[PDB]
Amino acid sequence: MHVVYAVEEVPIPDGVKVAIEKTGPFDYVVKVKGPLGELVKEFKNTPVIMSLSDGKVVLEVLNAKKREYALLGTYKGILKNMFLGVTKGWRYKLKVIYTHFPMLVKVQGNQLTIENFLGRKSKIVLEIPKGVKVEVKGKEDIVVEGIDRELVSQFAAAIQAATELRGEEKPSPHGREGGLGVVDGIYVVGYEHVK
Amino acid sequence: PKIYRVVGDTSTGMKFVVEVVGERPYDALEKVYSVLGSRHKLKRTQIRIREVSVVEPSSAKSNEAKMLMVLEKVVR
Amino acid sequence: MIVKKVLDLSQIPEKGEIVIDAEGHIMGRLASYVAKILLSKPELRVVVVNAEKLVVTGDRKMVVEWFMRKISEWRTHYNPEKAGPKIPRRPDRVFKRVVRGMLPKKVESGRDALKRLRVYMSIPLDFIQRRRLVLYEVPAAKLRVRPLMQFVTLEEVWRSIDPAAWEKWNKAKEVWAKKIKQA
Amino acid sequence: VKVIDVGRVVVKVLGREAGRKAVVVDIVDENYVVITGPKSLSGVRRRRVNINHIEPTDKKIEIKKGASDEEVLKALEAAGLVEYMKERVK
Amino acid sequence: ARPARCYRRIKGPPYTREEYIHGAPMIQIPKFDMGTTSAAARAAFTMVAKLVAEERGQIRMQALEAARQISSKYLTKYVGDANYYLRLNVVPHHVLRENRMLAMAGADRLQEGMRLAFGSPAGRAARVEPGQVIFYVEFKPEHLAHVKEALRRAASKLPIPTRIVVEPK
Amino acid sequence: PKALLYVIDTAKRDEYPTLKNFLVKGGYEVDVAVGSRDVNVNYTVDLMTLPSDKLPTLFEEYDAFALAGGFKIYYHVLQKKPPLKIWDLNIDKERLAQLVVEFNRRRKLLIAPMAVPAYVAQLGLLSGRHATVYPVTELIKILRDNKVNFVNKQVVRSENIITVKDITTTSEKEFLAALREKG
RNA sequence: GCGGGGGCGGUGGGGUAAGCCUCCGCUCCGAGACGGGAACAACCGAGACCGGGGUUAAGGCCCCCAAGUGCGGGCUUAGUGUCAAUCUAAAAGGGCGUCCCCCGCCCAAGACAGCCGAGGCGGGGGGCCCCGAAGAUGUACAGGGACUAAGCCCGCCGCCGAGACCCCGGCCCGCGGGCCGUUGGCCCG
């Protein structure tokens, strides 16, 4: 359909200061600061008009189609994650599951290393991005923390992907005559806030 | 500016009732001819306008028409 | 100093040289105006600067693949240096080739017109050092920026199809930035 | 981007009344607005105009939607733009 | 059999007078009316679906038979023979010809190429016009989804585009 | 004085702008009326939606009544099928006849160009009077069948009714001479 | 001369089809210049004595290339496509991808989705586009540059543009008339 005018409002929580800067004809840079840190997000080439009103972020589209109107809900959802990111933080939880070979997960500096995955001599090494903290709880659980939910979720997804074999190395998911097969890996199990 | 309710039907068997905002009935009909011509590949001879009537904004069905009525500015 | 002006399509001088700042201009649309100017003013020289800031509309992957196919698949099986095509990659050479395609072919007037065109990436130092540099824009050939519209610059195309050559030019800009900034 | 709003003084760039000043007095849709010279003042009749054929100036007066010519003319006095309207650009 | 595209278009006059045609093939459709055909029980049915031709053309006898089988089997399975009436509405009157070199078909058939080109009978087809009803169904409104599916399967066997029209009796 | 200019049709491209120009140069102030949705010109009096009780207000307020009757009137007078459907008379015929007769009764000025004089003749308002018409065979015959004396002048005034052959071939002086005449 | 050929029409009749075979009719090429169609006997325009001026036809008006980066509305995101045919293409089928039209039912704020508060569920159709869509010397071929309109749909305004049409000058011709003693010459209409 067609939208003459549509508006959305995102209430800024207490202690959070939001700055909106126009870096181009339709580009925006939104800086969000809270007790837990500062996030910076870019909204480039966008039809959404972004503005501040006494403690809210106002999002508007004018003369918009479905494509442009759909971006109001998206930007509201992104901004809400930013506000919760600087007040409560984001924690993604992962579970280590093995069948015969116990995996050894350790964090050394800014490297996350997984050893003995399926008894392989190769070592899975991942680079931990700035703003992400990884802690290994016992032998079964991994926790990824940060203020940028996109950054934190993406890294947690990378850990899970690193243990998913592809091509000729992919094991059969089901066993003989239909039981569970070789299902080893690290699986993202859920998320929650730090506070 | 007024909302015009345009009732019509086409030689291809399609019927329509639409609300178009315009200054005069002539302007509203021009929008109907060009939009229907664009969106359904209908020549002007294939379109038969049966009834044109002003409908007050309070009773209109289209939120597009209502929102245009109260416009204070436009952007290009 | 640099003085920015709008080029009057009916008040082009018959003699001398005009400098057109290509920034924000659509490549094919600016080439069309440049080609006509060179033919209709047989004594005028045309300089185009900032050729790496020319814009090609469309999806980045679509534009890059089009250039990749041109520089890779278009060839000859006869003697390549004697009989084959020679595809430009650098933005100043790319744009000059675009103008060649809009000029009369295999005639002196088409050849003479192209010899009266000079294209530069960024602004040359000698042009900058001038006491008064008049830079023209052609508004009908300028890109009207709209949300959710896709386009690329000739510089981004060059980086995609010749990264090492682009890196050197980028480094040269950095090396001479201080002296260029002084002038 | 171009912004046309009720009360804005605009210049017509197409048609016989090209170069003349006018005041936006109503919005038809996203593409057309209503402008009035006022005629007695600048020579622009009260008609609809496409947005592509006007350019906004930096002057704005305060009026209601569909303001009559007299109301527009009075508001042109509280702002002191009467001689601004008689001037023809280009 | 040749691909059906070879006999799809109407390229000449109808060829149906079997008293002038030597070796005209027999019709290979066993029944044309399926389900509950008695007029008394059809009064229970109150809905009508039609598979209507969208173009003019020739439908071969084996395509009509293939369409009849798939739709009637589906209706028998899902609706029940007591709850529907299905009629194949067109009859393959037109005789198709082919110009091929053959033995035991006449001496002229032994000359190669376009000499003596008039073909020997090769099959049968129905000549249909746009808007013509190919299949006709009478059913109870509770089975609308099943009847539409049966006619969708019939249409996939036919050489011309068709459309399904549902109306009350 | 004020004149009401009923724009029935615009198929004759220059009929309405020319008629309005002459009336303005004749000292009148012209109000435009429209009775159909196909006319593209601006108007201030909507004869399509104007209530019938408001008609007596209209006769008092205007001193002249002019009819820009293009080919719509021409094919209605002849009772003939036009070559275009848009040339059909798609206005309220009873209201139009009511307007002409009422303005005529109060001895107000009537301007009848092209085929309008034959429409006024068919209403019986020119019996025994002098009038001109668009000089085609059928229109001249209709004037003579309604006991009107056809005159072969461009602009003819019969004491309150001005008839013109074709406003687009009428000079300003001829029209203004008849406006300033006595009736 | 008694070899014809092209376009369009008779589902002509035949043939899987054919730039195929065999009839019927108008026109054109053969025996016809010239403008447009990228090139091109027969597609569109149009019929050419010679020179010059003017105006149009088909078609075109971003550059190549004379004339519009012409006007209003809408659609497409695929460089899809880029103003009939010869000429370089596409089907059955799938897609709320997106724009739009209609119908049935629910909600009278106790509907749909997991107390909340406003619209919701299903069917039929239309436009554009996507998949279906695979080839051999050399680039998103169908003129090239390139273009997000310089594409497509509904409408509109002006202009360019032939040897056509108009005008001037020159020439020749057919027919008729007249004059000159003429196997011919000259003049006029």
Add this chain to the structure above:
RNA sequence: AGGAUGCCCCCUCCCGAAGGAAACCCCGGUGACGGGGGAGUACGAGGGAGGGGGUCCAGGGUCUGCCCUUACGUCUAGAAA
């Protein structure tokens, strides 16, 4: 053996077929633009008259620029083939 009483430029004047504007004023249209006046004007193939200045003009060889342009003879429905 051709013109040199020429040719060329400028200026001025006269006549002028078909055709034929513009600035600007007025009326209409969102607009590209249309219409009334300006104006059948300025101009316009060509046909006449004069004045000032210059020196060859026509013709030819060859080269360049722009526009146009598919060897000939032949049988053939169809020839650059």
